[PDB]
Amino acid sequence: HQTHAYHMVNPSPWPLTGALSALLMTSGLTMWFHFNSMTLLMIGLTTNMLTMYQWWRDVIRESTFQGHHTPAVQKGLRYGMILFIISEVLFFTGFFWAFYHSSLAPTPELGGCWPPTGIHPLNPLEVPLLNTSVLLASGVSITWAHHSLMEGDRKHMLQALFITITLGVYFTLLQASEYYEAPFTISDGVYGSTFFVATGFHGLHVIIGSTFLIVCFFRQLKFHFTSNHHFGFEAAAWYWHFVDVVWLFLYVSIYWWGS
Amino acid sequence: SGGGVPTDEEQATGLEREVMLAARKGQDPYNILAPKATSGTKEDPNLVPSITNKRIVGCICEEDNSTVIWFWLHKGEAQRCPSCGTHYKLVPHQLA
Amino acid sequence: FENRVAEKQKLFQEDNGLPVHLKGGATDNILYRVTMTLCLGGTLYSLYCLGWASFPHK
Amino acid sequence: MAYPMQLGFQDATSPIMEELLHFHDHTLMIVFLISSLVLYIISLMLTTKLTHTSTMDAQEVETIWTILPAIILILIALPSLRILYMMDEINNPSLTVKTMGHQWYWSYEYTDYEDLSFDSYMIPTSELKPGELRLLEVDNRVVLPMEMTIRMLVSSEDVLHSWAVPSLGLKTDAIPGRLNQTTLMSSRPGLYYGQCSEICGSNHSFMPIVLELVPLKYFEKWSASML
Amino acid sequence: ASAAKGDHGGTGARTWRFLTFGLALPSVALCTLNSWLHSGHRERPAFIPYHHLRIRTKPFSWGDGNHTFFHNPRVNPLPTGYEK
Amino acid sequence: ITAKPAKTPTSPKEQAIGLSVTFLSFLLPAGWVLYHLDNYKKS
Amino acid sequence: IKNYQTAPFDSRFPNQNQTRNCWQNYLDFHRCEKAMTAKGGDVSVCEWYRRVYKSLCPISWVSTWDDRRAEGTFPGKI
Amino acid sequence: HYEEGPGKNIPFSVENKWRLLAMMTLFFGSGFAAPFFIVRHQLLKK
Amino acid sequence: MFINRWLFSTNHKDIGTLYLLFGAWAGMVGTALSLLIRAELGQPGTLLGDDQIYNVVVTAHAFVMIFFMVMPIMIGGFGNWLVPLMIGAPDMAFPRMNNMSFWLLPPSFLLLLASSMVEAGAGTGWTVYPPLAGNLAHAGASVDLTIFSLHLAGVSSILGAINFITTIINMKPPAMSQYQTPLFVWSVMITAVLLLLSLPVLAAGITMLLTDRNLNTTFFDPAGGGDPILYQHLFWFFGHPEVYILILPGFGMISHIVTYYSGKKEPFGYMGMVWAMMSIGFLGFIVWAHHMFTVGMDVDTRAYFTSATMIIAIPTGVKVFSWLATLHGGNIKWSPAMMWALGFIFLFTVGGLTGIVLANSSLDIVLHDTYYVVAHFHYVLSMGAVFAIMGGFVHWFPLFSGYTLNDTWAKIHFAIMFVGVNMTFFPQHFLGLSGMPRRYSDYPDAYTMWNTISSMGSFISLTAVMLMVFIIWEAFASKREVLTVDLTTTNLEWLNGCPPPYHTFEEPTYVNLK
């Protein structure tokens, strides 16, 4: 019998099926980009979701139902999640670097100016400003959600969390809308490239964060979270603030200054 | 304010519950805390709980030493650190 | 909704020597064998596609 | 050029490459000082039966072997940086030539007065005339006046290349959409060989550079003969 | 700064709900007002066939290979100018 | 470090066999490919 | 104001990257040539810019920038 | 429970030294051979 | 059982064992690619064909040796095996995620191998610079397969890094401070921090390269207002930290080996060795443009990057002197491992000193993209990283296996390899000053002699690689079981026997707070 507080995890097939699903998604993109075919990509996407679903299912089984998340285990998960966010900060930094590289030194081929000749930028005081207010508002509502949980208030937690998710979804539809209305494309040179790749990665992150809050919502409905033990929700909240802060830097850098 | 959110007291299970109960009775069966040292003499040895006949002891002989001295402590007479000579005695078991 | 968390604690702490990914019954086993089948199938398929692309076609 | 069993740099053809030779000698002297000192001290530590396996106290000797190295790096940095800023110095050149890298050959443009330009390809090994150097000879050499400051501008029209002439102490990368400047000053006439110094596809090994440095008068008539 | 508001008496759930409904969502409401009140089909920009735009080094691996993924014909010309 | 004697000792003759098989497993395939290089190029 | 051998040192462009030096003098020429035709004047005031741009700019760049002016796709403000 | 001790904490058997020689041969051998076959394959297309 | 044990592992020792097997195999692939390089250059003329198939081989050689041999053995292998045993931890913080780190690598390798099978392969160099790496000069799937291989390996190492940092911070004995962990553990925690901050910038860069090749972005295409130089910044911002990543776990192993075979209880100047590794980690993030001294940057930038690059010698120097001070008054055991460690100390110093020559932007003009640079980095990699790996491997093989190597054979192996790697790389300094470029399938006639000696050196190294496979076989065929280990009071990893049981520290260590 063990006299430490750490979790010895049952042998699991999900690491292997995640690794193999990574192969199927990267093969699949290669088959898509070059041999115009999506089959392999479709299978890899499917095995990826089935893996994410069963892996995180077991984590809930291990924590809520089997009680393996001692305070020691919980300290580890906090560190793991801060470290993952930090790695995502450095990822976005490459896209900010690329943008600042191009915009502070516009080449002759653009007309030696920013924005480039021929580019009609969005107004930052229109939908960009609305997007900004939707996300900042959602940071207030998720904070209310957190304090409600800590004070033991099920109804207000769910209400605040619901508002948070609605605002996340609103931001996504407004951004889809802006993408479609926009008079430049990803192919409109380095302005289009920096714009759609930076904002598009961020948008993907809004969707991942929204999904995570929705998982949190259904878990709260089923009384998984105690007033003291709810790390799944803390992680979702930290991730959401990250998505918020990244939007502010995008708004200031790309929408306001680089227009 | 409504309620509806369970407490740890109500809903904590397995080892989380065990660690939580044991904590309230000022006890540390899962070695979450640093044990406090005695004078470590023959008559006042460091008492080393173990659920078996032997347990690895690490002795930080002087504060701020960067090197821990490692040895197996067995059931029986008090043993000494090979380096500073402080005394350790294996006491029992039970824990869980 | 109702707090059935205690029901699930009982079920997932049963001492039946099943690993956590199989411990919720027949469905766990179905979902597992489907996942593992799509993975092994998709892998054989990707090696075949790789073989096909290693040779030119006129 | 390089000759068989060469150990060190090609003999200098410019003041800069001369100044680099002397700096390398300085640096290498120190490299020998340090590598030999470490080898001696190793054999020192391994050649005695005498032991002392108890704790040793660190903060006295830790001082020596932080501070000495620092002074040595200043002794290298000073000359290094003098030379660096001297290679960028305000030039006042008499001629501006452009080289444009391509897969796999160099083109050269002298466009101060006339639109003179030409392609420069490696002589194949099968077409070499006795005494001509495998992989080094071009069909159309880069003729330039000796003892004159020249502005060389380097770009490419496809992938990266790099325009190098070791003898004159020159390497400037050829990047499409960019104009990189270096300055060229031969102290002597002759032929001076370089090779493409950036991986650029199938024939990266087979697109070399030959300078022909001659007096201004001969340069003038060559230019005219070449339109 | 300290914003300009007032509170800091206690940062508990009531205070954060007060900010959600009293400030956060009202801001969303104003910015939604200002937005759907400044946009109504923006006069489509003239097509000059600039070479640093409508880049096509390789066909897209969807459609006819010449259309971006959120192609809007009202505002996005192909390299050969606008369609219908 | 101290050890028991070999439980299944490896005689000189047995090492000679094992070293030979080890070397030939590296050299024979490489050698085949390298030996036939020109038959490939003439294509 | 001549005896031109080649484009002199320009303190605006003191570093190894000379791309902008080629570009500025090419705009500077075609801007001057435009203003001296639009105000009926002497086009050869613009002559220095032409000498410096012809000296520094690759032929292929000048070719391309010229065809684009003709075509009305030139991105620089003239 | 999994088996403990020398020759037991490895995914390959060391029970018979000649069967082991045969495995190690295919293993290290397949790895060293691969680049030579890749180079042969590139020469036989182009 | 096999499947549960070996495909579904949550055990740090078994995952460690998977990493060592993968690394060893990859190492065979890399050795063969390195003989093809030297076969081509062993006499004047053409062996294979154009620089394209040559540079496919040269590119694969670097990717295999760096991502599939050195990083899996040192971080995945030694790191998973030893870090828990040295801090008295029952396993890693995230043992299931730890398994995925391992299983991402064979797919990663399959994609890189696939890249050399399809089309003309990726003859880009391991830097994969556009435009040569772009969709004209490298049309088709080879470069895309290479980008995707690098993605899977970057994810593997990022997940591994989060695991190691969390384990070393969160899972020590409660009384144990960070300043009471052994130097190997320090070395892995700092490597993990560099991986976490460096690899995501690579991922961004090669993603932007993927979109330029397939979604008509122009990040790096001047046609669209892009800049090939931007790719170089992003790549080297990762690329220089990557070489410190490759050597830090080796610095750690060397500290342990030199301490052990001197019969010292601890290395000289422990806190100075921690200070030096943190200083090397930090300085290695602010020097990247010393890889870009010929691209046309401002002289004042070139002066900064020269000066900043040189300061790294100071902390590195503290480590070298501390190793020699640990030897001082030692009861020296002339073990195979000790020979590896001394070879490291001298040969890494030479490679570091040629690194300092290259730090000079003025001199780097003439030495850039020549064999001088190749000689520098093979001194620190073939005779630094690889020497630390061999030293660690023969030291700790009995811990992993329960069996001993034949020491006489191990010494014969070191002697052969020492001659081979020095005969291969020493002459390359001459080739470089004399101006022989990198990435050339063939060279002017004057360069013949040094290329012939170098190529001959590489065949001696092959004989050593072959002898090692035999040496490992002999140990498992003979079955000399370990009885007794010296100096276990200061080497916790040995204290559970050889090999340690599946579960170690089910009952944690006892350590008093005093």
Ligand SMILES: CCCCCCCCCCCCCCCCCC(=O)OCC(COC(=O)CCCCCCCCCCCCCCCCC)OC(=O)CCCCCCCCCCCCCCCCC
């Ligand atoms: C030690 C290494 C590993 C041991 C294993 C064996 C292999 C290792 C070799 C190891 C034997 C070392 C021999 C020293 C090379 C002498 C060349 C020289 O004077 O170099 C001068 C220059 C420039 O040359 C010139 O511009 C003027 C040269 C004049 C030439 C005219 C006549 C030509 C004479 C014929 C020479 C034939 C070539 C023979 C050259 C040999 C070919 C293989 O070349 C260079 O920069 C090359 C320098 C490369 C930088 C590497 C750092 C080396 C330091 C560490 C070594 C340990 C030393 C510690 C203190 C000393 C104790 C060792």
Ligand code: HEA
């Ligand atoms: C483990 C791998 C490794 C390590 C540890 C290093 C260490 C160093 N490297 Fe190296 N390097 C590479 C791997 C490595 N490098 C690789 C792979 C490339 C090629 C990239 C490519 O493919 O293009 C490269 C390229 C490279 C370049 C680019 C050259 C060019 O492309 O033109 C430069 C320039 O500064 C450089 C410098 C240094 C410096 C200053 C150190 C320092 O860290 C060395 C410090 C050590 C010492 C100095 C010795 C110990 C110190 C003392 C004994 C103290 C006393 C000494 C003095 C006072 C001087 N390296």
Ligand code: HEA
């Ligand atoms: C760690 C990295 C690493 C290692 C070890 C090596 C090892 C070798 N390398 Fe390589 N090399 C590179 C990384 C490495 N190299 C890189 C990054 C480049 C630049 C690529 C580019 O320009 O794009 C390069 C370039 C390069 C060139 C220049 C190519 C050119 O410019 O055309 C040459 C030419 O000789 C060369 C040769 C060799 C040789 C003969 C060895 C021999 O020493 C090999 C001997 C074999 C070993 C050292 C392996 C032994 C160890 C094992 C098999 C592990 C076993 C482990 C266990 C059992 C646990 N290398």
Ligand SMILES: CCCCC/C=C\C/C=C\C/C=C\C/C=C\CCCC(=O)O[C@H](COC(=O)CCCCCCCCCCCCCCCCC)COP(=O)(O)OCCN
């Ligand atoms: C271009 C311009 C350039 C200018 C550049 C100049 C400066 C940059 C700006 C800022 C940085 C300046 C200095 C930073 C240095 C140190 C600050 C030290 C503060 C500190 O450390 O204080 C601690 C933290 O303070 C805390 O968070 C704060 C606690 C606040 C309590 C009192 C606040 C009362 C103010 C009014 C309340 C407003 C209501 C807010 C709610 C509505 C929202 C609008 C004290 O914590 P404690 O005792 O545990 O409290 C517990 C009680 N609950």
Ligand SMILES: CCCCC/C=C\C/C=C\C/C=C\C/C=C\CCCC(=O)O[C@H](COC(=O)CCCCCCCCCCCCCCCCC)COP(=O)(O)OCCN
């Ligand atoms: C609400 C916003 C969020 C949208 C999400 C839903 C569906 C879109 C699909 C994929 C988006 C996901 C990832 C982001 C990647 C690339 C940037 C794409 C951003 C985007 O969506 O931008 C669009 C371009 O999409 C295009 O063409 C490209 C279409 C997509 C092609 C698939 C790209 C896949 C390759 C990405 C590489 C993955 C590697 C990641 C590394 C992992 C970590 C190591 C813009 O539309 P447009 O018509 O050009 O201009 C508008 C004209 N009015």
Ligand SMILES: CCCCCC/C=C\CCCCCCCCCC(=O)O[C@H](COC(=O)CCCCCCCCCCCCCCC)COP(=O)(O)OC[C@@H](O)CO
């Ligand atoms: C981060 C917090 C600390 C503060 C950081 C401050 C340091 C650097 C950032 C600010 C520097 C901008 C200064 C701009 C002034 C000059 C404008 C300019 O133009 O610089 C340009 C480069 O800027 C560029 O992209 C710059 C792109 C940025 C590259 C640096 C990458 C660092 C990333 C790591 C940070 C991680 C921390 C995360 C923070 C939340 C290009 O150079 P030029 O030489 O002009 O090219 C033309 C030549 O022909 C002229 O000779």
Ligand SMILES: CCCCCC/C=C\CCCCCCCCCC(=O)O[C@H](COC(=O)CCCCCCCCCCCCCCC)COP(=O)(O)OC[C@@H](O)CO
């Ligand atoms: C076309 C669209 C494609 C999109 C594909 C991706 C889609 C969706 C991904 C959504 C993310 C969902 C993650 C949910 C994880 C649920 C498991 C969980 O949350 O587990 C919790 C622990 O957290 C833990 O392990 C921590 C779990 C951390 C997970 C966070 C990671 C987010 C990962 C995103 C990665 C992508 C990044 C972008 C790269 C391109 C359990 O502990 P507690 O909550 O304290 O409970 C215990 C109490 O009951 C006790 O009484």
Ligand SMILES: CCCCCC/C=C\CCCCCCCCCC(=O)O[C@H](COC(=O)CCCCCCCCCCCCCCC)COP(=O)(O)OC[C@@H](O)CO
């Ligand atoms: C097409 C382009 C290629 C794409 C390649 C994609 C690669 C792989 C896809 C398959 C991965 C999805 C499957 C889910 C992974 C779950 C990770 C996780 O959730 O791991 C958790 C810990 O990490 C933590 O907290 C925090 C860490 C959360 C990590 C997020 C996991 C997703 C991996 C994405 C990494 C992206 C990196 C971003 C920078 C590029 C749990 O630890 P375990 O060891 O499980 O158990 C511990 C037990 O005590 C719990 O009861």
Ligand SMILES: CCCCCCCCCCO[C@@H]1O[C@H](CO)[C@@H](O[C@H]2O[C@H](CO)[C@@H](O)[C@H](O)[C@H]2O)[C@H](O)[C@H]1O
């Ligand atoms: C790190 C995570 C990476 C995730 C990568 C996600 C994979 C990319 C998703 C691609 O999604 C598909 O894109 C196709 C684009 O090919 C769409 O159909 C396309 O196919 C038809 C013909 O090919 C056209 O007529 C349609 O207009 C066109 O939208 C298709 O509906 C859509 O599902």
Ligand SMILES: CCCCCCCCCCO[C@@H]1O[C@H](CO)[C@@H](O[C@H]2O[C@H](CO)[C@@H](O)[C@H](O)[C@H]2O)[C@H](O)[C@H]1O
């Ligand atoms: C860098 C790694 C390379 C290391 C050097 C390898 C040394 C060569 C040892 C093994 O090579 C064998 O040599 C034979 C040549 O002697 C080849 O047979 C070939 O040559 C014979 C005629 O000379 C014929 O009898 C055979 O049938 C014909 O296939 C055979 O295929 C090859 O395996």
Ligand SMILES: C[C@H](CCC(=O)O)[C@H]1CC[C@H]2[C@@H]3[C@H](O)C[C@@H]4C[C@H](O)CC[C@]4(C)[C@H]3C[C@H](O)[C@]12C
């Ligand atoms: C069902 C549950 C009551 C507590 C319980 O389940 O026992 C209540 C409390 C909070 C409710 C939700 C929140 O009030 C947020 C939403 C409020 C809107 O009126 C729409 C429904 C809405 C999405 C609600 C759905 C559902 O009625 C919830 C989830």
Ligand SMILES: C[C@H](CCC(=O)O)[C@H]1CC[C@H]2[C@@H]3[C@H](O)C[C@@H]4C[C@H](O)CC[C@]4(C)[C@H]3C[C@H](O)[C@]12C
């Ligand atoms: C446990 C083992 C996994 C084997 C592995 O990981 O290599 C099992 C799990 C599910 C099994 C698969 C499915 O249950 C059923 C499939 C149909 C046939 O029974 C054989 C192939 C088939 C595709 C199976 C192969 C293999 O027996 C699998 C993959």
Ligand SMILES: C[C@H](CCC(=O)O)[C@H]1CC[C@H]2[C@@H]3[C@H](O)C[C@@H]4C[C@H](O)CC[C@]4(C)[C@H]3C[C@H](O)[C@]12C
């Ligand atoms: C004070 C600190 C740690 C002390 C401890 O708590 O053990 C020590 C560890 C290593 C020391 C440093 C290293 O010994 C290297 C340098 C040595 C010089 O003699 C002084 C500065 C120098 C930079 C030292 C300053 C300071 O004494 C450090 C940083």
Ligand SMILES: C[C@H](CCC(=O)O)[C@H]1CC[C@H]2[C@@H]3[C@H](O)C[C@@H]4C[C@H](O)CC[C@]4(C)[C@H]3C[C@H](O)[C@]12C
């Ligand atoms: C290399 C990088 C630009 C990257 C890019 O062009 O995209 C630039 C951006 C900021 C620059 C630095 C800052 O301008 C501050 C310093 C200015 C000094 O004149 C040179 C060193 C100095 C430390 C610079 C070095 C280098 O040129 C940096 C780091």
Ligand code: CUA
């Ligand atoms: Cu041009 Cu190499």
Ligand SMILES: [Cu+2]
């Ligand atoms: Cu570097």
